[PDB]
């Protein structure tokens, strides 16, 4: 079996799993200090410029309550790293990657699903496929 440790994260009631191997850190940013750069939004932390992506916007999920303080996973693809705002920080966990089959062949945003403890589903974010 293919085990992998991952951060369980939430958008509304949906569960996404970001493999821990890709997380750089986890901060709590405040609307107050996001900056508009061109078409993208960034935070700068310790002089490092990191573009932030809301996860619901990245996945096109209906959602509105954009709070003043929000939790955000920073991930890293090669040598560029970038933020991912989420709703809830569920917890760290050990999951078994199952493939979600031939009908999702084209979905670059994910890389498989996991069945959790209570038998609910999490889909695994493919960090190098979320722009």
């Amino acid at each position: 079996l293919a085990i992998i440790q991952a951060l369980l994260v939430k958008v509304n009631n949906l569960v996404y799993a970001i493999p821990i191997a890709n997380i750089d850190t986890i901060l709590s940013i405040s609307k107050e200090d996001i900056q508009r750069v061109q078409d993208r939004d960034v935070i700068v932390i310790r002089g490092e410029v990191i573009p932030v992506y809301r996860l619901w916007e990245v996945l096109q999920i209906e959602h509105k309550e954009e709070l003043e303080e929000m939790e955000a996973v920073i991930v890293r693809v090669g040598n560029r790293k970038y933020g991912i705002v989420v709703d809830d920080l569920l917890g760290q966990d050990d999951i078994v990657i199952k493939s979600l089959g031939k009908v999702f062949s084209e979905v670059k945003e994910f890389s498989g699903a996991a069945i959790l403890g209570d038998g609910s589903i999490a889909l695994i974010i493919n960090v190098s496929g979320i722009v």
């Binding site: 096109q60 493939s99 979600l100 089959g101 031939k102 009908v103 084209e106 979905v107 589903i121 889909l123």
Partner: protein, 140 residues
């Protein structure tokens, strides 16, 4: 001839069926997990007997009309390695048939090779579907 066993179901005012050898089980539409950024006709994935199975809207795949309130059943079928849950209104039962009560009138060209023919039962039509060709279409 040959003896054929098929599963007949309804997608609103229209009755269809596919070959029973491909069905694993018919479960009740309970709970489906969306898979963002996927094709328009996939509803999502379900957890069934500890495995992930994609559930698709058969009406959307064929192109016939449907009412969401009524999509209550999931026929879980498989061909070769690929396994899929087709969302339908209601299962009607099994039918035992023979390729000679199988009317091949060319009423329409809409369903391509997805159609296998009509089955007349008491003068009451049922479309016989090629389940493999539906799955083949739906994968790559």
């Amino acid at each position: 001839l040959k003896e054929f066993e098929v599963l007949s179901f309804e997608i609103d005012e229209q009755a269809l069926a596919f070959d029973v050898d491909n069905i694993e089980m018919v479960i009740e539409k309970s709970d489906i997990t969306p898979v963002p950024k996927s094709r328009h006709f996939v509803e999502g994935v379900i957890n069934l007997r500890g495995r992930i199975i994609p559930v698709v809207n058969l009406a959307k795949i064929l192109g016939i009309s449907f009412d969401e309130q009524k999509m209550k059943s999931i026929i879980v079928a498989r061909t070769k390695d690929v396994e899929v849950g087709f969302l339908v209104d209601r299962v009607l039962g099994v039918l035992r048939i023979t390729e000679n009560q199988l009317d091949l009138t060319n009423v329409s060209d809409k369903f391509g090779k997805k159609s296998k023919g009509l089955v007349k039962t008491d003068g009451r039509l049922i479309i016989y579907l090629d389940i493999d060709k539906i799955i083949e279409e739906i994968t790559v």
